[PDB]
């Protein structure tokens, strides 16, 4: 079965064969789509075929499908498999693996960089010292003064479920978020639950608008440990709007580097559920979603006052105009001073070129339109006139509960 | 089976059961979504007439009364006898309202029961439907302060007799590509404009033509006719700061009357049912202007702006789009001509989905659609999740009629 998708700017047709591959299921049926829905231990027995298929994909990409190498491979994790249960990656399918799961990602508009991705394979780690070591040289590394560089630090794969590595954080850098008793929040909303969490934990908070998290990093399935990042190791941009100059007395800055560190990532049936992976941001993350969202730092107001618009009626669009000007002023900052971002316009074109590319060698690119149309200015980039397949490839990434919710406390 | 739908910026939970009674397809599976594609007999006419009044006599209240049993009997006799039926007025109005309230694309739904229905089943000429369709247009208009609407003309018998309104809208501007190559006018409607050129029109060829109308009546070869100008209320664009503004010469018309969609109820077909309401800005602004294949006008207003053009990322697509939907929305409140805004439209949606949640278990929405083309994620749309799925009375989309229709 082959299907169709239209881009209805460009009339450009491409076919999807890929969807052909996809195993795992979608929440939608013939009754019922579930395309805006936001989320939607493993014995021998369902193992060896998701070994299987993997190192049938892998062997295929290295052009060795069928080969004396490929055999023995197969042959060699499947003993390990009914020997000890479950089995280990070589370096290169752990590579190829974290790839993929990258490339997979429907939700990912930064795809077409894909293929470079630098892997740190942390999985002779054994303790909470050892995974603040190699986070601290994943962002160091990521970082790059500005030039950012995308990364991903794998942790040793799930056994038996009580043994796991977790990154307590939701990502290697936030900064933290205070419920006041008159029920303001200070500092970023969407972290106070897990800023709570440190403070029990131990940690003495600054208390500021703009704290930078410390580390609870899980070894082992052993209880957590806090850490501080060093600060020469946290890039901090302050925002400022180039031709506004009460926008910098906002007293706004973010941090330059968006690494991901919740996720589980699944190759062959195996599960890495510390896996924190970095790549660079699209302004549009920080001057819509973290500083506009209502939940988040809110700042539409305060802007749209110091510029004066009309705020009477909605249908000034102060919003919309407020919204721009703050976005403006994110890319700005960090062109100004050499941190790698993309604008919107930019990242969305690259991805319908990588797109059609991935139809052409491929025979498909999986894509969540609900995710990859960015969060203002829709219809005015080619994304938003792009139809689109969404299905799940392995390897991929995935959601987890918050270990708070399901780890068992030693004490 | 009982789902649940989230709204992210409040955590309201709503739970839907209405989804159960979903009767057609979504074009998804469990393997692939399609979410974003745009597209995806006497024995089958009683279950649907069935089903239809069934939910007719459950919303007045009388669920297995005699007359519901009497009706379905009566309708039952209908369809044996001559393999169709005929509505009763209440059960037209009441399926033309529902069709609206079902529409899973359409974000100005809390409106859905202050719909006017003209009935035009007595139509049986074009000289007819254009009467009824101008009657439509004066009495939607209503000199600016717009009314819903809809006009129904006789439905499908054997597909040889439909009657079509061959216009996307009742009111629409030409498409004329050039020798010199580009596009003069709207290019989404530069076929249809060859259509009715090579059907007799005279193009005064400019830049916002009212088109004329096409109309076809039992399946017969369809003709056009002119709007009296007089019913045609179109609002000069001006911005309320850049003065050049008015100078870019545009316009937009005030009726947005959408006319190639075919209304199902109980198992009939009203391939011929123009409706109308009224545009929320950036139906305009953002993509009848801004679209590249449409007026595509956000080049040229930059330039008046003098934003850096230079480089993607000085945002200056997105400050002249936010400027001219400031334009769009700012002339027609000045003309007195109702309009709404995306923030204002989709807060009513959110009351509205609550509303249905609580009287109905739930409300179909389909959130690619709903979520505006600028400014997604500060309306409160884009953090709510929506369920989508297909419920009868519907309109649905056919065939344009020049692939159909024999001469
Ligand atoms: C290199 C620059 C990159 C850019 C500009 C980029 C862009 C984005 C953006 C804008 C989103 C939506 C984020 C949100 O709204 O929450 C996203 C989602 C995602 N990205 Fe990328 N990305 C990049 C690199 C990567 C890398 C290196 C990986 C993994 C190796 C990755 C994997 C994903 C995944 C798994 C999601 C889904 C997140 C979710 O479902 O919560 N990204 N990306
Ligand atoms: C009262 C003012 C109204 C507002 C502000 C409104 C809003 C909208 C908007 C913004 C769209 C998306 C249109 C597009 O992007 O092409 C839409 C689609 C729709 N609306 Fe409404 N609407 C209104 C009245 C009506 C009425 C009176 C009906 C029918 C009786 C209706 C039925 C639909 C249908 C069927 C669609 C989508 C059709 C499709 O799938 O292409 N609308 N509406
Ligand atoms: N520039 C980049 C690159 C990769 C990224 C990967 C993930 C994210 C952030 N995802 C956060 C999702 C938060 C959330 C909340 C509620 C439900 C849900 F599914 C996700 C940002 C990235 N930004
Ligand atoms: N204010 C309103 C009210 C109701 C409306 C109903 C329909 C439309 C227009 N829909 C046109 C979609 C055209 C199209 C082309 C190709 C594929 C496809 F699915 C739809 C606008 C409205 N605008
Ligand atoms: C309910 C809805 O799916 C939810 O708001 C989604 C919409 N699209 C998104 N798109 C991106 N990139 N990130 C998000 O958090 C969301 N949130
Ligand atoms: C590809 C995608 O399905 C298509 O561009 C859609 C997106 N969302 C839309 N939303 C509305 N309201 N109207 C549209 O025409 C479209 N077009
Ligand atoms: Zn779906």
Same mark, same amino acid.
């Given at each position: 079965?082959?299907?169709?998708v239209?881009?209805w700017?460009? &009339? #450009?047709?491409?076919? %999807?064969?890929?969807? *052909?591959?996809?195993?795992?299921?979608?929440?939608?049926?013939?009754?019922?789509?579930?395309?805006?829905?936001?989320?939607?231990?493993?014995?021998?027995?369902?193992?060896?075929?998701? +070994?299987?298929?993997?190192?049938?994909?892998?062997?295929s990409?290295?052009?060795?499908?069928?080969?004396?190498?490929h055999?023995?491979?197969?042959?060699?994790?499947n003993?390990?498999?009914?020997?000890?249960?479950?089995?280990? *990656?070589? &370096? !290169?399918?752990?590579?190829?693996? @974290?790839?993929?799961?990258?490339?997979?990602?429907?939700?990912?508009?930064?795809?077409?960089?894909?293929?470079? =991705?630098?892997?740190?394979? +942390?999985?002779?780690?054994?303790?909470?010292?050892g995974?603040?070591?190699?986070?601290?040289?994943?962002?160091?590394?990521?970082?790059?003064?500005?030039?950012?560089?995308?990364?991903? !630090?794998?942790?040793?794969?799930r056994?038996? $479920?009580?043994? %796991?590595?977790? #990154?307590?954080?939701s990502?290697?850098?936030?900064? @933290?978020?205070?419920?006041?008793?008159?029920?303001?929040?200070?500092? /970023?909303?969407?972290?106070?639950?897990?800023?709570?969490?440190?403070?029990?934990?131990?940690?003495?908070?600054?208390?500021?608008?703009?704290?930078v998290?410390? *580390?609870?990093?899980?070894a082992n399935?052993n /209880?957590?440990?806090?850490?501080?990042?060093?600060?020469?190791?946290?890039?901090?941009?302050p925002?400022?709007?180039?031709?506004?100059?009460?926008?910098? &007395?906002?007293?706004?800055k973010?941090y $330059?580097?968006? @690494?991901?560190?919740?996720?589980? =990532?699944?190759?062959?049936?195996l599960?890495?559920?510390?896996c924190?992976?970095?790549?660079?941001?699209?302004?549009?993350?920080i001057?819509?979603?973290?500083?506009?969202?209502?939940?988040?730092?809110n700042?539409?107001?305060?802007v749209?006052?110091?510029?004066?618009? %009309?705020?009477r009626?909605?249908?000034?669009?102060?919003?919309?105009?407020?919204?721009?000007?703050?976005?403006? +002023? #994110?890319?700005?900052?960090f062109?100004?001073?050499?941190?790698?971002?993309?604008?919107?316009?930019?990242?969305?074109?690259?991805?319908?070129?990588?797109?059609?590319?991935?139809?052409?060698?491929?025979?498909?690119?999986?894509?969540?339109?609900?995710?990859?149309?960015?969060?203002?200015? $829709?219809?005015?980039?080619?994304?938003?006139?792009?139809?689109?397949?969404?299905?799940?490839?392995?390897?991929?990434?995935?959601?987890?509960? %918050?270990?708070?919710?399901?780890?068992?406390?030693? $004490?």
């Open positions: 079965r082959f299907l169709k239209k881009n700017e460009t &009339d #450009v047709v491409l076919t %999807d064969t890929l969807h *052909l591959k996809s195993t795992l299921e979608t929440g939608c049926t013939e009754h019922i789509c579930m395309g805006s829905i936001m989320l939607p231990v493993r014995t021998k027995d369902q193992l060896f075929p998701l +070994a299987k298929e993997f190192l049938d994909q892998y062997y990409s290295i052009k060795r499908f069928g080969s004396k190498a055999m023995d491979r197969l042959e060699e994790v003993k390990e498999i009914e020997s000890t249960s479950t089995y280990q *990656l070589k &370096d !290169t399918e752990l590579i190829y693996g @974290a790839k993929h799961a990258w490339r997979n990602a429907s939700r990912c508009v930064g795809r077409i960089q894909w293929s470079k =991705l630098q892997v740190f394979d +942390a999985r002779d780690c054994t303790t909470a010292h995974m603040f070591n190699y986070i601290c040289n994943h962002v160091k590394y990521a970082t790059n003064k500005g030039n950012l560089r995308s990364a991903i !630090t794998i942790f040793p794969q056994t038996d $479920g009580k043994h %796991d590595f977790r #990154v307590w954080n990502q290697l850098i936030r900064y @933290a978020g205070y419920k006041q008793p008159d029920g303001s929040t200070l500092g /970023d909303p969407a972290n106070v639950q897990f800023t709570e969490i440190c403070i029990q934990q131990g940690w003495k908070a600054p208390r500021g608008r703009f704290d998290l410390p *580390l609870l990093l899980q399935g /209880d957590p440990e806090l850490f501080q990042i060093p600060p020469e190791l946290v890039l901090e941009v925002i400022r709007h180039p031709k506004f100059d009460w926008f910098k &007395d906002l007293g706004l973010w $330059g580097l968006p @690494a991901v560190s919740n996720m589980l =990532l699944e190759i062959g049936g599960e890495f559920s510390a924190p992976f970095s790549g660079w941001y699209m302004g549009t993350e001057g819509v979603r973290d500083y506009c969202d209502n939940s988040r730092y700042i539409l107001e305060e749209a006052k110091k510029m004066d618009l %009309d705020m009626k909605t249908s000034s669009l102060w919003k919309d105009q407020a919204l721009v000007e703050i976005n403006i +002023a #994110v890319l700005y900052s062109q100004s001073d050499k941190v790698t971002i993309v604008d919107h316009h930019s990242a969305t074109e690259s991805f319908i070129k990588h797109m059609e590319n991935e139809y052409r060698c491929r025979g498909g690119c999986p894509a969540d339109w609900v995710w990859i149309v960015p969060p203002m200015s $829709g219809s005015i980039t080619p994304v938003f006139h792009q139809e689109m397949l969404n299905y799940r490839l392995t390897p991929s990434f995935e959601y987890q509960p %918050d270990p708070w919710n399901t780890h068992v406390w030693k $004490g």
